A paper describes a structure:
Spiroviolene synthase (SvS) from Streptomyces violens was first described by Rabe et al. and represents a bacterial class I diterpene cyclase that we were not able to produce in sufficient quantities for crystallization due to protein instability. Terpene cyclases such as SvS form a variety of complex multicyclic compounds with potent biological activities via carbocationic, electrophilic cyclization cascades of relatively simple substrates, either by metal-ion assisted release of an allylic pyrophosphate (class I mechanism) or by protonation of an oxirane/ene-functionality (class II mechanism). We previously reported a hypothetical ancestor of SvS—SvS-A2 26—which shares 77% sequence identity with the extant enzyme.
To this aim, a small library of 24 variants of SvS-A2 was rationally designed, based on the SvS-A2 crystal structure targeting the active site as well as surrounding residues. One representative variant of each group was subjected to crystal structure analysis, and Cα rmsd values in the range of 0.35–0.68 Å compared to the parental SvS-A2 structure indicated that none of the variants had significant conformational rearrangements. A Trp156Tyr exchange (Group III) results in a highly active and diterpene specific SvS-A2 variant. The exchanged position is located directly opposite of Trp79 and the introduction of Tyr may allow for additional cation-π interactions in 2, while yielding sufficient space to accommodate the bulky diterpene intermediate between Trp79 and Trp82. The Trp156Tyr exchange slightly reduces the melting temperature of SvS-A2 (from 71.3 ± 0.0 °C to 67.7 ± 0.1 °C) and more so of SvS-WT (from 58.2 ± 0.1 °C to 45.2 ± 0.3 °C).
Residue numbers in the entry:
A (entry chain B): 7 to 87, 96 to 232, 241 to 311, 324 to 359
B (entry chain A): 7 to 232, 239 to 311, 324 to 358
The structure:
């Protein structure tokens, strides 16, 4: 019993989505990241071009939209897999290959593909935009390492730890750090790293992450964490999860409205990218198994302007004294 | 049987080191990082203020040299109690969770410690870094910090499996696990010189940072030689069937080659550098030298000897380490 999603945000998709999808399907087939035709079909069936065309709907350069979409395909293909000890090494190697073009594949299937993506990013993006994506990619790999860690030990994390980890393990950091690369609109340091923008970025990531949890009811996820800790039933957890998520999005809209008016063209595009991304991520979740009409919740299920109790690690999102920008 | 260190770089130490060491000893006592009197005295005996006062010897504000110095103390304590000998040293699953929690505590001032002694200490250091560094410098430190932790996770993974990495994985891993990224990312905070994104992130500058880090990491491995530990020596003894004495000569050759390429690239990049990049590059240089000099002095006033010449002066990439070959590629580092 799944309530409709609260997402009063702009929905749009690149007009050239289908041309990019074609080129991306080509690159998947040639990438070497897939053993069998059955594995390609699985990665092709993620419709990651359709996903990311919703994040950068007006990207001037079709090739930047392709490069950024390819990573999303790479991410789905990488996460369809490993013990923590081998993973920590593999995470280290893959991330080195992202940062070091002279790194060699050593027969690892994912490294050439990521290095082809990195080479496309280095031919378009500034060294600054590449370093942002690089750091986001390591943050994601740390999240995955954390989640594989918990599973191998049978640690079910409490809410604060789950939300912190899922911030990273969902792949939201690298996805949102590709907005600039797709658009070409370079956000200056003093704007991109304002705490206020950091909280907007994390809050957009968290809501996309909790919406991915919801699209997965069909084993570390907000529902398990709430059931295991708060002794809730599935329904009671579904209802509590929707309240957490809707409260976070409410904070996002509020902080966004405080921040958007003073913003430069580049930060402004980035912020419309967060919004497009949150909505795109929800809409892609509903439309992926395409053209049927979607139903959306008109109101938050919880309107509280105060921080989530039991999640101190995300409380600073609500602390305007800390975010004076 | 160890040859002297090739290190023809500026030795200098902050004229206020002794005052800063005093306030840092005070902070280590009320820090909470340390269970016993015995640990406190260990942390203190790292002389981390002397170490980092070599990295930023003209720091205008000793509060900034202090804050940065604190992380170096936190660093030794974190390695010694969580990474090298802690029940976590062979438990990557548990270490992966700790690294997530410690990193989150550094990015999120509202995070709670969950009874981990190292977190409130880190959060205090973070609060200082935020009080006078720009949010850009704080993020460069925070990113460098997760990089360091990823390296330790890789190291601890290898220890659990009894896996001795090869030269390529070892140099890539050690680039991170030896804590040089966050060490060097504190130069800006210590000095107040905000290096613009366009300059800091130039591949040439990134390569100098990595080479400054590799060299300091291999001087650390040299410092730790005075079988099963992952270091350049067991790496070479295992993968290339060498005696310890052959590994030692081999390690010295590779390290000196990297230092020469650092020196060559430094000389091509320094002339055009703006004032903030120039300060950062003097830091890399002061750091390399500071790391080695601190390592021969840490039990310290006696005359040291240095190698007048490198052990190998080949101007091309290390054999068997393609992950660093791009440091020699002047086209990619335009």
């Amino acid at each position: 019993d799944l309530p409709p999603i609260y997402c009063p945000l702009e929905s749009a998709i690149h007009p050239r989505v289908h041309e990019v999808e074609k080129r991306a399907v080509e690159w998947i087939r040639r990438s070497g990241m897939c053993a069998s035709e059955e594995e390609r079909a699985w990665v092709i069936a993620t419709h990651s071009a359709d996903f990311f065309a919703r994040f950068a709907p007006t990207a001037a350069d079709e090739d930047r939209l392709l490069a950024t979409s390819l990573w999303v395909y790479w991410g789905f293909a990488f996460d369809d897999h490993t013990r923590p000890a081998q993973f920590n090494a593999l995470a280290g190697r893959v991330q080195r290959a992202l940062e070091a073009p002279s790194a060699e594949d050593n027969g690892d299937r994912f490294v050439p593909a990521l290095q082809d993506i990195a080479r496309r990013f280095r031919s378009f993006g500034t060294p600054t935009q590449v370093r942002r994506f690089v750091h986001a990619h390591r943050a994601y790999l740390s999240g995955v390492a954390w989640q594989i860690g918990n599973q191998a030990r049978g640690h079910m994390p409490g809410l604060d730890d789950y939300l912190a980890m899922r911030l990273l393990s969902a792949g939201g950091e690298p996805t949102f750090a590709m907005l600039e690369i797709a658009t070409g609109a370079e956000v200056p340091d003093r704007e991109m790293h304002r705490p206020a923008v950091r909280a907007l970025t994390e809050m957009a990531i968290m809501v996309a992450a909790l919406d991915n949890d919801r699209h997965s009811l069909r084993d570390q996820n907000i529902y398990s964490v709430l059931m295991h800790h708060r002794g809730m039933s599935l329904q009671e957890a579904v209802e509590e999860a929707t309240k957490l998520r809707d409260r976070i999005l409410l904070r996002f809209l509020e902080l966004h409205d405080r921040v958007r008016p003073g913003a430069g063209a580049e930060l402004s595009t980035y912020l419309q990218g967060l919004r497009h991304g949150i909505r795109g991520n929800a809409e892609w979740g509903l439309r992926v198994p395409e053209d049927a009409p979607l139903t959306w919740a008109e109101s938050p299920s919880d309107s509280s302007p105060s921080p989530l109790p039991g999640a101190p690690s995300i409380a600073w999102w609500w602390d305007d004294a800390l975010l004076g920008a």
